[PDB]
Design a protein around this nucleic acid. Structure first.
Length: 56
RNA sequence: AAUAAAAUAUUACUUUGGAUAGUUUAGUUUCCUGGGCGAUGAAGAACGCAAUGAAUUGCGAUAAGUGAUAGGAACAAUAAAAUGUGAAUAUCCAAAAUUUGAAUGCUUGAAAGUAUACUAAGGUAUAUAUGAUAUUCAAUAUCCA
C-alpha cells in the first residue's frame, strides 16, 4: 500500500439535527444604540474639546 | 522652738471610670413536622443596579424591582411624580435571570481572547465517560463464490 501508518478511516459525518430547540431566548439584541451610549461627559474639560478639536 | 506650703484623715459637691440596679427584637437545650439542591447549570465567588448610598438588605441589563392573584390608602431624611381607573404589603405562580463556578468547544494569572456549524451584530450546539437506535466504515477474525 506504499505506506506504513494506519489512521482512522473517514466515515460519513452528518450535521447536528436536534429534534427540539435547545433555547427559547427572545431574539432581541440587548446592546443597541440606546444602551451603548449612557450620556455625554459634561465636565469643563469635555466642553473645551468640543470647540477647538471638534470632538464629542 | 515655730511654720502649716507640701503630707495625712473625715464629709459634701464636681470630675475620669463604667460597677451596681431595672430591662431585652439575642443566645442555649429538649421536643414535634419535614429533611423538599444540580447539565432544565446547583452551592460558592465576582461585578453591577436606588433621585440623592459607603456598608448592609433586596435584586440581575425588565436592576431596593416587572406581570398575575390577593390586598385595601400609604411612604417620609428631603424633595418630585403617581395613587379608590387601586398606594403600601404578601407569594411554593408567570416572564426575566450579567461574569464565573461540577463548568462542559479551546485557552485562562490578575487573560486581554478565540475555532467551526446553524439561525454583519446577537443567540444556540460542539468537554470526558456512558445505554439504546440509526448510518458510515475497519479487520480474510470465521466461513465463503
Amino acid at each position: 500500500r506504499y505506506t506504513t501508518a494506519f489512521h482512522r478511516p473517514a466515515t460519513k459525518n452528518a450535521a447536528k439535527a436536534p429534534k427540539y430547540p435547545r433555547s427559547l431566548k427572545a431574539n432581541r439584541n440587548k446592546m443597541d444604540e440606546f444602551s451603548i451610549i449612557k450620556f455625554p461627559l459634561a465636565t469643563e474639560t469635555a466642553l473645551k474639546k468640543i470647540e477647538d478639536h471638534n470632538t464629542l
